Amino acid sequence: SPTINFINFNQTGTCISLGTSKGFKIFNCEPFGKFYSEDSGGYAIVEMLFSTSLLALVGIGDQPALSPRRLRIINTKKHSIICEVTFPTSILSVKMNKSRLVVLLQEQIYIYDINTMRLLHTIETNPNPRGLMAMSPSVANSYLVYPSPPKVIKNGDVIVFNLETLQPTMVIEAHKGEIAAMAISFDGTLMATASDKGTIIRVFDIETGDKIYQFRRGTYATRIYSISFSEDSQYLAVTGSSKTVHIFKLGESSRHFASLKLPVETNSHVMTISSIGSPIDIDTSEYPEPVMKMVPIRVVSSDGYLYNFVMDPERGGDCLILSQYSILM
């Protein structure tokens, strides 16, 4: 039985990247199935480009060849190695769209042309120990957002950086405290942020800097693990240490529009990621709660299961858990 170290969806929500102590795995979401697998060694980062065969790996450290300071770019259809780049400190994050690749270190950001692999720019950051950043999956609004703390008020400033021209566009005073999560809409239009107090979720317009939405999350401060826009930007999923997943609806303030309840059986210190899918149609029977259009949402947990929920786009509330599958069987 292997330990899970990393999980992510691809930019579309159709595939799952996963990295364990013994290899890495790649799944299709629906109909669920392993698409690729490898027993090489321990991995810390496994990141996809949308459904191309290119993926980026960083080994966790149980091998001389996969030090945490090394990005390796592989092709799964060719079984080839496109490239490898090394960095002065451990890699904390890797993000991609079809024009640029970004590697995130605690105090630097590296920005590459993804076809050439020519390094285009490097940003010197103040310490980002939590490896927080968000990158637009659309080339047309190709934006990267990353936290901008003071070098040890204004702890929750965020930098919006234009990847195409490699120049910063604005500073958003998003939060009063350290940033704890960030997401960017599929069209590179909106940004969503939360601070380490997880009480308030904010949504800004990238072009303006104008705060467009503010949601209250929970009552007492709890940690936030993830934020994700649905592709049409009408819903926003946030997961944190409460074992609850909250869905907020994007039309002063608002509490959450719906919630997902992961099974009581799961460990309570498990971290999760989610993605909200395009709506679909369901027959009433075979699922108590006659053909309504639900909104499907997927939640996958560190303990290694994928969960299928559906939300009622008009009534919200607590969402029904449709299904569950597992990784490494």
Short mmCIF file of C-alpha atoms in Angstrom, two decimals:
data_model
loop_
_atom_site.label_atom_id
_atom_site.label_comp_id
_atom_site.label_asym_id
_atom_site.label_seq_id
_atom_site.Cartn_x
_atom_site.Cartn_y
_atom_site.Cartn_z
CA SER A 1 0.00 0.00 0.00
CA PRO A 2 1.47 3.33 -1.12
CA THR A 3 1.23 6.83 0.30
CA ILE A 4 -0.35 9.54 -1.88
CA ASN A 5 1.73 12.71 -2.22
CA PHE A 6 -0.01 14.77 -4.92
CA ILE A 7 -3.34 14.98 -6.76
CA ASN A 8 -4.62 17.39 -9.40
CA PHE A 9 -7.11 17.61 -12.23
CA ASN A 10 -6.03 18.71 -15.68
CA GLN A 11 -7.10 22.17 -16.82
CA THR A 12 -10.46 20.83 -18.04
CA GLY A 13 -11.44 18.51 -15.18
CA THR A 14 -11.52 15.45 -17.46
CA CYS A 15 -8.38 13.74 -16.11
CA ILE A 16 -6.65 13.15 -12.78
CA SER A 17 -2.93 13.34 -12.14
CA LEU A 18 -1.73 11.51 -9.08
CA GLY A 19 1.71 10.95 -7.59
CA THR A 20 2.56 8.35 -4.95
CA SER A 21 5.56 6.90 -3.15
CA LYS A 22 5.97 4.18 -5.82
CA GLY A 23 4.98 5.83 -9.12
CA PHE A 24 2.49 8.14 -10.78
CA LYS A 25 -0.99 7.58 -12.19
CA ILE A 26 -3.30 9.21 -14.72
CA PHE A 27 -7.06 8.69 -14.85
CA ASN A 28 -10.01 9.70 -16.94
CA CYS A 29 -12.85 11.12 -14.87
CA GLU A 30 -15.99 9.83 -16.52
CA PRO A 31 -16.13 7.05 -17.46
CA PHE A 32 -13.52 6.52 -14.75
CA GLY A 33 -10.44 4.51 -15.60
CA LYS A 34 -6.67 4.42 -15.34
CA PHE A 35 -5.20 5.90 -18.49
CA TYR A 36 -1.53 5.59 -17.56
CA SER A 37 0.62 4.27 -14.73
CA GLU A 38 4.28 4.00 -13.70
CA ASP A 39 6.20 2.32 -10.88
CA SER A 40 9.38 4.40 -11.05
CA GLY A 41 9.71 6.00 -7.62
CA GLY A 42 8.38 8.61 -5.24
CA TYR A 43 6.92 11.74 -6.83
CA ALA A 44 6.01 15.13 -5.35
CA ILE A 45 4.40 16.80 -8.41
CA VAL A 46 2.55 15.27 -11.37
CA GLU A 47 1.02 17.92 -13.66
CA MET A 48 -0.80 17.57 -16.99
CA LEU A 49 -1.31 19.64 -20.05
CA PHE A 50 -4.90 19.39 -21.03
CA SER A 51 -5.10 15.95 -22.65
CA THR A 52 -1.83 16.05 -24.55
CA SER A 53 0.70 13.36 -23.74
CA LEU A 54 3.03 15.92 -22.12
CA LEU A 55 3.28 15.91 -18.34
CA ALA A 56 5.72 17.43 -15.84
CA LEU A 57 7.24 15.49 -12.92
CA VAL A 58 9.34 16.29 -9.87
CA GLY A 59 10.62 13.39 -7.80
CA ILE A 60 10.17 13.38 -4.06
CA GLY A 61 13.76 12.47 -3.21
CA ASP A 62 14.14 8.69 -2.94
CA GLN A 63 16.46 8.61 -6.01
CA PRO A 64 19.64 10.41 -7.16
CA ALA A 65 17.94 11.21 -10.49
CA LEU A 66 14.71 12.82 -9.19
CA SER A 67 15.88 15.35 -6.60
CA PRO A 68 13.20 17.89 -5.54
CA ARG A 69 15.14 20.51 -7.54
CA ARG A 70 14.56 18.86 -10.94
CA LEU A 71 11.67 19.29 -13.36
CA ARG A 72 11.40 16.50 -15.94
CA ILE A 73 9.09 16.77 -18.98
CA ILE A 74 7.88 13.42 -20.38
CA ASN A 75 5.57 12.26 -23.23
CA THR A 76 3.27 9.38 -22.26
CA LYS A 77 2.46 8.27 -25.82
CA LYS A 78 6.11 8.27 -26.93
CA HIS A 79 7.54 7.02 -23.59
CA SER A 80 10.21 9.66 -24.28
CA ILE A 81 11.78 12.38 -22.13
CA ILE A 82 11.37 15.79 -23.73
CA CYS A 83 13.47 17.76 -21.29
CA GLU A 84 14.77 18.36 -17.77
CA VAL A 85 15.62 21.61 -16.01
CA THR A 86 17.22 22.06 -12.60
CA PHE A 87 16.66 24.77 -10.02
CA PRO A 88 18.64 26.10 -7.05
CA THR A 89 15.97 25.16 -4.48
CA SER A 90 13.16 22.61 -4.33
CA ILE A 91 10.29 23.00 -6.79
CA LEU A 92 7.08 23.96 -4.98
CA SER A 93 4.66 24.10 -7.90
CA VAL A 94 4.34 23.71 -11.67
CA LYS A 95 1.57 25.15 -13.87
CA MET A 96 0.84 25.18 -17.60
CA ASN A 97 -1.27 26.46 -20.43
CA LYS A 98 -0.62 25.88 -24.12
CA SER A 99 1.77 28.87 -24.34
CA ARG A 100 3.87 28.99 -21.14
CA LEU A 101 5.19 26.77 -18.35
CA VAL A 102 5.79 28.15 -14.86
CA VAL A 103 7.88 26.61 -12.07
CA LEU A 104 7.32 28.01 -8.57
CA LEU A 105 10.07 28.13 -5.93
CA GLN A 106 9.76 29.63 -2.46
CA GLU A 107 11.47 32.87 -3.58
CA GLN A 108 11.50 32.72 -7.41
CA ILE A 109 9.21 32.07 -10.38
CA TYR A 110 10.49 30.70 -13.69
CA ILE A 111 8.51 31.41 -16.88
CA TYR A 112 9.21 29.40 -20.07
CA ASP A 113 7.97 29.16 -23.65
CA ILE A 114 6.45 25.68 -23.49
CA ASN A 115 7.23 24.68 -27.09
CA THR A 116 10.86 25.84 -27.14
CA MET A 117 11.53 25.54 -23.38
CA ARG A 118 13.38 28.86 -23.67
CA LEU A 119 13.41 30.59 -20.31
CA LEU A 120 11.57 33.86 -20.84
CA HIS A 121 11.51 35.49 -17.43
CA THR A 122 12.29 35.04 -13.74
CA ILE A 123 10.52 36.83 -10.88
CA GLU A 124 12.21 37.24 -7.51
CA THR A 125 9.52 36.73 -4.87
CA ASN A 126 9.37 37.17 -1.15
CA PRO A 127 9.09 33.80 0.61
CA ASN A 128 6.16 31.71 -0.64
CA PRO A 129 6.61 28.63 1.59
CA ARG A 130 3.14 27.33 0.73
CA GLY A 131 3.78 27.30 -3.02
CA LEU A 132 0.67 29.27 -3.95
CA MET A 133 -0.05 30.48 -7.48
CA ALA A 134 -2.73 30.31 -10.15
CA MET A 135 -2.32 30.29 -13.92
CA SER A 136 -4.95 30.94 -16.59
CA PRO A 137 -5.61 27.91 -18.84
CA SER A 138 -6.52 30.24 -21.75
CA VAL A 139 -3.79 31.78 -23.90
CA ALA A 140 -6.00 34.75 -24.81
CA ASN A 141 -6.06 35.99 -21.19
CA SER A 142 -2.76 34.33 -20.24
CA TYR A 143 -2.34 35.54 -16.66
CA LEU A 144 -0.46 34.31 -13.61
CA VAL A 145 -1.43 35.45 -10.10
CA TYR A 146 0.80 34.95 -7.07
CA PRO A 147 0.98 36.25 -3.47
CA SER A 148 3.04 39.32 -2.58
CA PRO A 149 3.79 39.53 1.15
CA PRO A 150 6.19 41.99 2.77
CA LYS A 151 9.69 40.71 3.37
CA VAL A 152 9.89 40.04 7.11
CA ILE A 153 -0.03 45.79 7.04
CA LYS A 154 -0.66 44.50 3.44
CA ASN A 155 -0.05 40.80 4.01
CA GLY A 156 -2.69 39.74 1.48
CA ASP A 157 -1.49 41.53 -1.64
CA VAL A 158 -1.56 39.59 -4.90
CA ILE A 159 0.39 40.25 -8.10
CA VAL A 160 -1.32 39.81 -11.46
CA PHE A 161 1.34 39.10 -14.10
CA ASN A 162 0.90 39.03 -17.87
CA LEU A 163 2.59 35.91 -19.20
CA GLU A 164 2.39 36.97 -22.87
CA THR A 165 4.30 40.24 -22.52
CA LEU A 166 5.98 39.21 -19.23
CA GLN A 167 5.06 42.33 -17.30
CA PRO A 168 2.91 42.91 -14.19
CA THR A 169 -0.51 44.45 -14.71
CA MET A 170 -1.68 45.35 -11.18
CA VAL A 171 -1.52 44.77 -7.43
CA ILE A 172 -4.76 43.65 -5.78
CA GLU A 173 -5.03 44.20 -2.02
CA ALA A 174 -6.97 40.97 -1.77
CA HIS A 175 -6.70 40.14 1.94
CA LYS A 176 -5.44 41.56 5.21
CA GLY A 177 -3.70 38.27 6.06
CA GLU A 178 -1.43 35.77 4.32
CA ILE A 179 -2.99 34.23 1.23
CA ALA A 180 -4.04 30.61 1.76
CA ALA A 181 -5.63 29.74 -1.60
CA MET A 182 -6.10 31.15 -5.09
CA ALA A 183 -7.85 30.16 -8.31
CA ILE A 184 -8.30 31.72 -11.74
CA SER A 185 -11.27 31.26 -14.06
CA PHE A 186 -10.99 29.09 -17.17
CA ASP A 187 -11.09 32.14 -19.45
CA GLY A 188 -8.46 34.02 -17.43
CA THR A 189 -11.19 36.47 -16.44
CA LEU A 190 -11.63 36.21 -12.65
CA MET A 191 -9.49 35.52 -9.59
CA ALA A 192 -10.67 33.96 -6.33
CA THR A 193 -8.66 34.27 -3.12
CA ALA A 194 -8.86 33.42 0.57
CA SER A 195 -6.58 34.24 3.47
CA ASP A 196 -5.32 31.86 6.17
CA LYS A 197 -8.47 32.52 8.20
CA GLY A 198 -10.77 30.92 5.61
CA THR A 199 -13.74 32.99 6.74
CA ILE A 200 -14.02 35.18 3.65
CA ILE A 201 -13.72 34.16 -0.02
CA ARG A 202 -13.15 37.01 -2.45
CA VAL A 203 -13.58 37.18 -6.22
CA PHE A 204 -11.96 39.96 -8.25
CA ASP A 205 -11.99 41.06 -11.87
CA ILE A 206 -8.45 40.72 -13.23
CA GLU A 207 -8.73 43.59 -15.72
CA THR A 208 -10.11 46.11 -13.19
CA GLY A 209 -8.95 44.89 -9.82
CA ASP A 210 -12.53 45.34 -8.64
CA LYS A 211 -13.73 42.94 -5.97
CA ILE A 212 -16.84 41.40 -7.50
CA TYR A 213 -17.89 38.90 -4.83
CA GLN A 214 -17.43 38.20 -1.12
CA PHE A 215 -18.66 34.97 0.49
CA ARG A 216 -18.58 33.93 4.12
CA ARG A 217 -17.23 30.44 4.72
CA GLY A 218 -17.97 28.56 7.95
CA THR A 219 -18.12 30.41 11.26
CA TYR A 220 -14.80 29.89 13.08
CA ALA A 221 -11.53 30.14 11.18
CA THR A 222 -10.46 26.91 9.50
CA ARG A 223 -7.82 26.18 6.89
CA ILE A 224 -8.66 26.26 3.17
CA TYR A 225 -7.18 23.64 0.84
CA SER A 226 -8.58 24.46 -2.59
CA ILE A 227 -10.64 26.80 -4.76
CA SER A 228 -11.84 26.05 -8.26
CA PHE A 229 -14.05 27.81 -10.78
CA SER A 230 -16.51 25.95 -12.92
CA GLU A 231 -15.71 26.56 -16.56
CA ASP A 232 -18.75 28.83 -17.05
CA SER A 233 -17.73 30.76 -13.87
CA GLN A 234 -21.15 30.44 -12.23
CA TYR A 235 -20.01 28.25 -9.30
CA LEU A 236 -16.96 28.19 -7.04
CA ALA A 237 -15.83 25.18 -5.00
CA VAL A 238 -13.76 25.53 -1.82
CA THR A 239 -12.34 22.65 0.24
CA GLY A 240 -10.68 22.88 3.63
CA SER A 241 -9.96 21.21 6.95
CA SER A 242 -13.66 20.97 7.89
CA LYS A 243 -14.27 17.78 5.85
CA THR A 244 -17.05 19.86 4.22
CA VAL A 245 -16.88 21.16 0.63
CA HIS A 246 -18.70 24.42 -0.03
CA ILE A 247 -20.20 25.63 -3.30
CA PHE A 248 -20.74 29.35 -3.83
CA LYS A 249 -22.90 30.76 -6.62
CA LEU A 250 -21.70 33.66 -8.75
CA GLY A 251 -25.00 35.30 -9.63
CA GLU A 252 -23.15 42.42 -0.79
CA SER A 253 -22.23 39.15 0.86
CA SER A 254 -23.37 35.54 0.76
CA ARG A 255 -22.89 32.34 2.66
CA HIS A 256 -22.55 29.11 0.67
CA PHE A 257 -25.09 27.90 -1.88
CA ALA A 258 -24.45 24.18 -1.31
CA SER A 259 -22.26 21.63 0.43
CA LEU A 260 -20.72 18.18 -0.10
CA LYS A 261 -20.41 15.80 2.85
CA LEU A 262 -17.57 13.32 2.49
CA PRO A 263 -18.18 10.00 4.29
CA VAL A 264 -17.77 9.86 8.05
CA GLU A 265 -15.49 6.83 7.51
CA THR A 266 -12.73 8.96 5.96
CA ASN A 267 -9.83 10.23 8.09
CA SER A 268 -10.48 13.77 9.23
CA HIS A 269 -7.01 15.09 8.30
CA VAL A 270 -7.45 14.32 4.58
CA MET A 271 -6.99 17.02 1.94
CA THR A 272 -9.19 17.13 -1.15
CA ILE A 273 -9.41 18.74 -4.55
CA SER A 274 -12.60 19.28 -6.53
CA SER A 275 -13.80 20.29 -9.95
CA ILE A 276 -17.27 21.40 -11.03
CA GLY A 277 -18.37 19.91 -14.33
CA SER A 278 -20.62 21.13 -17.09
CA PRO A 279 -24.29 20.46 -16.23
CA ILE A 280 -26.07 17.33 -17.43
CA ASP A 281 -29.49 15.63 -17.23
CA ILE A 282 -30.54 12.94 -14.75
CA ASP A 283 -33.59 10.75 -14.28
CA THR A 284 -35.11 11.11 -10.80
CA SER A 285 -35.42 7.42 -9.94
CA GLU A 286 -32.32 5.27 -9.35
CA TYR A 287 -31.36 8.25 -7.18
CA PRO A 288 -34.05 9.34 -4.75
CA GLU A 289 -33.71 13.07 -5.27
CA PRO A 290 -38.62 13.41 -13.82
CA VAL A 291 -35.46 14.41 -15.75
CA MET A 292 -33.74 17.41 -14.12
CA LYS A 293 -30.40 18.99 -15.10
CA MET A 294 -27.98 18.60 -12.21
CA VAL A 295 -24.47 20.04 -11.95
CA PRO A 296 -21.89 17.24 -11.48
CA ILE A 297 -19.01 17.85 -9.08
CA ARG A 298 -16.00 15.59 -8.43
CA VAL A 299 -14.03 15.50 -5.17
CA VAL A 300 -10.92 13.36 -4.76
CA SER A 301 -9.23 12.89 -1.38
CA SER A 302 -5.67 12.22 -0.18
CA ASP A 303 -6.74 8.90 1.32
CA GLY A 304 -7.29 7.95 -2.32
CA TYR A 305 -10.94 7.93 -3.39
CA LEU A 306 -12.86 9.88 -6.02
CA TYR A 307 -16.40 10.96 -5.14
CA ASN A 308 -19.21 11.92 -7.52
CA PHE A 309 -21.83 14.42 -6.34
CA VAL A 310 -24.61 16.24 -8.16
CA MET A 311 -26.08 19.58 -7.13
CA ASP A 312 -29.55 20.95 -7.87
CA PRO A 313 -28.74 24.23 -9.66
CA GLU A 314 -31.91 25.84 -8.26
CA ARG A 315 -32.23 24.46 -4.71
CA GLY A 316 -28.59 24.01 -3.69
CA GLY A 317 -28.32 22.69 -0.15
CA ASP A 318 -26.60 19.45 0.75
CA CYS A 319 -25.62 17.53 -2.38
CA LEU A 320 -26.12 13.82 -2.97
CA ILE A 321 -23.04 11.60 -3.22
CA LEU A 322 -23.45 9.59 -6.40
CA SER A 323 -20.40 7.37 -6.46
CA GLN A 324 -16.90 6.53 -5.27
CA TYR A 325 -13.87 4.85 -6.84
CA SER A 326 -10.31 4.27 -5.67
CA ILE A 327 -6.74 4.65 -6.90
CA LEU A 328 -4.13 1.84 -6.84
CA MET A 329 -7.15 -0.41 -6.25
#
